[PDB]
Amino acid sequence: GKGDRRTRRGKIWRGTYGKYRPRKK
Amino acid sequence: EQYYGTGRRKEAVARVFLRPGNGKVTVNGQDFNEYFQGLVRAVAALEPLRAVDALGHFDAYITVRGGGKSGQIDAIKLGIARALVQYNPDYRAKLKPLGFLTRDA
Amino acid sequence: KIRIKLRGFDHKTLDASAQKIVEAARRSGAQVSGPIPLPTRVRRFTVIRGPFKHKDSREHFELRTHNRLVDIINPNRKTIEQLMTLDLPTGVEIEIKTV
Amino acid sequence: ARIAGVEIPRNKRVDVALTYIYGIGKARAKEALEKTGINPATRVKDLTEAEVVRLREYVENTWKLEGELRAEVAANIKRLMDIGCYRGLRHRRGLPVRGQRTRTNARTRKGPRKT
Amino acid sequence: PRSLKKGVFVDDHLLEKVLELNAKGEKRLIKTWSRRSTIVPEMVGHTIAVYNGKQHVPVYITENMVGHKLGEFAPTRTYRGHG
Amino acid sequence: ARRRRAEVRQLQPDLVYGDVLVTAFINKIMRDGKKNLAARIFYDACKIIQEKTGQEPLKVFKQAVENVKPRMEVRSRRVGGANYQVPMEVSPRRQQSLALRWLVQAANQRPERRAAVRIAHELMDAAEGKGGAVKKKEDVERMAEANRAYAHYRW
Amino acid sequence: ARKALIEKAKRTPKFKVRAYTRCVRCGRARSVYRFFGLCRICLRELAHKGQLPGVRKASW
RNA sequence: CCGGGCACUCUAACGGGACUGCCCGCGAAAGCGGGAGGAAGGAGGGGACGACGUCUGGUCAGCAUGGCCCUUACGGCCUGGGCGACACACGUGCUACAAUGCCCACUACAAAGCGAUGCCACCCGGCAACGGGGAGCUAAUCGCAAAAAGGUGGGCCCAGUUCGGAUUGGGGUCUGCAACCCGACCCCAUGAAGCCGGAAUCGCUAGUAAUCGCGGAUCAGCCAUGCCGCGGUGAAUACG
Ligand SMILES: [Zn+2]
């Protein structure tokens, strides 16, 4: 979650882009 | 010949042009049943025409900005009322008891 | 050809002086672009009422930088002679630039 | 099935069953399952033996697993200690190291309520 | 921390002093204020003195340290219990 | 509320039946702000009451809510420094509202896995008159008849 | 340490991240705004006398 | 996209317009019901504003101000820490624990703010933070800038279970000469714990309970889930 980086919720909370959360809708 | 209406509710401005035709309706260049896919209140905007039994006597061009979904459709029926009081304004004594020209605050 | 920008805060006298610049340009004859109003940039500042230990009860200020744009496409000779000596600054910054 | 010797995953849906091993999760499990190509939809009771052996030889020899990873974290904390570091000192007290606050909540490794 | 595109322990003062020391010998005490870096890869048995804000404490170097900084060995906290 | 009678409120009618007695039912099962889940789980129940029996989901719902609304209810009244509980005719505005309130709590106690089959079966249980909500109504109606002797401390 | 602090705060060198923002008339070490460079009390004082340009008591 | 009209949308200005007037009811009146008419009513919703007095509750450690006081100092100086400590009690912020939930593919949605001592188009190389260039902008034009919650399409399914996930291990980016006790990043590998929370506690009656991104100020760096705006979206509820 919001502290984890290998998920999506924490990626939204940290506002970063990565492998699990890329820019493709 | 042409009747313009405006509908505003919950930050969704509906600009409605209804013309005399067969009853066809278009939303922002696209159509009704595809832009309102799988939702349940699509007939809520058609209700002011069902009340006057104007089933297939009015075509409409729809351009709405802002909001989500329900503010858009409530603004649509508000515009239909605002324009159906324009064309044949006798629909006030049968419009006021059912409650259409009521901007919900 | 020439972009004339007005940078101010008070839209009251700002819009009034801009309308009078439009009127003076219409007095000069030829057409001039209408006063396209640029949006206002807001610089907000949240301060505290008390001078100590009060995390709540904030007040908030704002800075409204209003901008107006007029573009002249008909640079008549005395129009540009008039607009350099008839500059009345009511606390508004003016920028007259050619391209 | 009997993949990593002693640790044995089996019983209804091999895909989530492999997540149940220390060292394999959903991401690395989807990695190995997409590499072996077996669809996750079937259970573990309907599977061919060669696929199980290739699963064994793939995950057993590609990454660091159970024995070496547990011994590695043991050597890691032994490396944190005997150097006089804040991390090793903090592990010696048996308190969390990731900057948490002990005035109110560190009971997971602090143990029960000692009133 | 400091990435691997850049190198660890980039300090020119004490390193020049200890390279001048490793060629002659005698291994005496060395004072240091900068505990901002690492000391572990090539220095062993050397006696240093790092400041904890109050007093320069002495520190001897071992082998069991692979990548530990300097200042984590000498804390600045004086707890001595609370009750 | 002191002088004003707390002005009445009529809901927007339903989109599939055009009534309003189902609207508040959707609104109470609407948990934490999810009408998309509320109306769908209500419409799932209207679909279940096609295969469980061949009845209309409106006519079976009227029977589900007619029996559960009570006739009487007791209230604690202070008459001279003493609290005597007196039963009275519960208003129809409170009848349906407390009725659906009993329906949702009766459905949430059912041991079935999905909430759809939980609410659908309890609706026909209320229509037949054996559900937990009509059971709760039957506790109140027997409590009122037990306090029947309070026929001179009325208001 | 209220004059020495504002006097040493002007010394932006010696690793600028060790430098901090400060009020210039009051001297508060925290919550000083980067858009004005003054403490919140200094803003409350000055902008109410109309001495601060462009500001306005927002009301909407 | 362009001539072009620019009516309009827009962006300001600045007026008008709604106010218990109307009439019927009710009441001596006040007030209280009905409709009309509207974009808005019978204060539209709010913003600012906070009578005389109050605890003299707070601070000379925001600054002044009576005094006292140290000056080879309580001044300054530069170094390092520390202020970030823990066996801890408290509140106050945030997510979740899944199946109206989790990933995954394009498409579409604002509105607020900065910036030619900077915002930074755009590439190249890299998975990348970044670098090699650099365009445009003193700036509704250039730029920050993707809005997001969403939808649909697929993968799954109540399984610590694509949910959730500590922490350990090492490497790539950059800010400060210098980042350890104390900054932020990019990445792997593991994933703690939470499948749902005692005595208690208080919030709040229509755009709020929820709910989602986007900016701005203290920033060299970030500790910030701190703050303030800014828009998306909007249920019941109020009989007593
Ligand atoms: Zn100040």
DSSP secondary structure, D34-46, as one string:
HHH---TTS-SSS
Nearest 10 degrees: CA dihedral of B46, B48, B49, B51?
120
Give G44's contacts in chain C (Cβ within 8 Å): 47, 49, 51, 59
Judge whether F89 and F71 are in contact, CB under 8 Å. Answer: yes
User: Which tokens in the block code for residue D39?
Assistant: 């669809």
Break-preceding residues in chain B (C–N over 2.5 Å): none
Q: How is chain E split into domains, by residue range?
A: 8-83
G7 known ligand binder: no
Distance from residue B101 (CA) to nucleotide H17 (C1'), in Å?
A: 19
Cα C29 from Cα C22, distance rounded (Å): 11
Judge whether D1 and D8 are in contact, CB under 8 Å. Answer: yes
Nearest 10 degrees: CA dihedral of F91, F93, F96, F98?
-80
Inter-chain residue contact D85 with E73, CB threshold 8 Å: yes
Measured CA angle at F71 (ends F70, F74), to 5 deg: 90
Total number of domains in chain F:
1
Exposure of A10 by Cβ count < 10 A (0-12 exposed, 13-18 middle, 19+ buried)? Answer: middle
Total number of domains in chain B:
1
User: Which tokens in the block code for residue D94?
Assistant: 């048996």
Q: In chain E, what is the straight-line distance between the N-terminal and C-terminal CA atoms, in Å? A: 37
Smallest Cα distance from F38 to chain B, Å: 12
Cα F123 from Cα F57, distance rounded (Å): 10
Q: What is the b/e burial string over F82-102, where b = at least 16 CB atoms within 10 angstroms of the residue's CB?
A: eeeebbeebeeeebbebbbbb
Q: Strand pairing partners for B17?
A: B4, B61
Nucleotides in chain H with any atom closer than 7 Å to protein CB: 6, 10-14, 33, 35-41, 44-50, 58-59, 61-63, 75-83, 85-91, 94-96, 100-108, 110, 112-114, 127, 139-140, 146, 148-152, 155-193, 206-207, 209-221, 225, 227-229, 231-240
CA of C7 to the centre of ligand 1 (A): 28
Judge whether B20 and B59 are in contact, CB under 8 Å. Answer: yes
Q: In chain C, what is the straight-line distance between the N-terminal and C-terminal CA atoms, in Å? A: 6
How many Cβ atoms from other residues are within 10 Å of residue E19's Cβ?
Answer: 10
- Domain residues for the domain of F107 are 1-155
Residues 6 or more apart whose CB falls under 8 angstroms from that of E38 comprise E8, E9, E67, E68, E69, E70
Cα D25 from Cα D2, distance rounded (Å): 17
Domains of chain G with bracketed CATH: 1-60 (4.10.830.10)
Count H helices and E strands in chain D, helices first: 6, 0
Judge whether B57 and B27 are in contact, CB under 8 Å. Answer: no
- The nt closest to D106 (CA vs C1′) is H88
Judge whether D20 and D28 are in contact, CB under 8 Å. Answer: no
What's the Rg (C-alpha) of chain A? Answer: 8
Complete DSSP assignment for E5-71: SS-S---SHHHHHHHHHHHH-----EEES--SSB-TTT--S-EEEEE-SS-EEEEE--SS-SS-BST
Residue of chain E nearest D86, judged by CA positions: E72
Residue of chain E nearest D87, judged by CA positions: E72
Element (H, E) at F46: helix F35-51
CATH code (residue F15): 1.10.455.10
CA of G36 to the centre of ligand 1 (A): 10
Cα B18 from Cα B82, distance rounded (Å): 11
Domains of chain C with bracketed CATH: 1-98 (3.30.70.600)
Residue of chain G nearest C10, judged by CA positions: G54
Q: What is the resolution of this structure in A?
A: 4.1
Element (H, E) at C38: strand C36-42
How many Cβ atoms from other residues are within 10 Å of residue B38's Cβ?
Answer: 5
User: Which tokens in the block code for residue D89?
Assistant: 């000192």
Instruction: Say if E and C touch: at least 3 Cβ pairs within 8 Å.
Output: no
- Domain residues for the domain of B49 are 1-105
Domains of chain D with bracketed CATH: 1-71 (1.10.8.50), 72-115 (4.10.910.10)
Judge whether G35 and C43 are in contact, CB under 8 Å. Answer: yes
Residue D101 Rama label (left phi>0; alpha psi -120 to 50; beta): beta
Domain at E8-83, CATH from 3.30.860.10, 3.40.640.10, 3.30.930.10, 3.40.80.10: 3.30.860.10
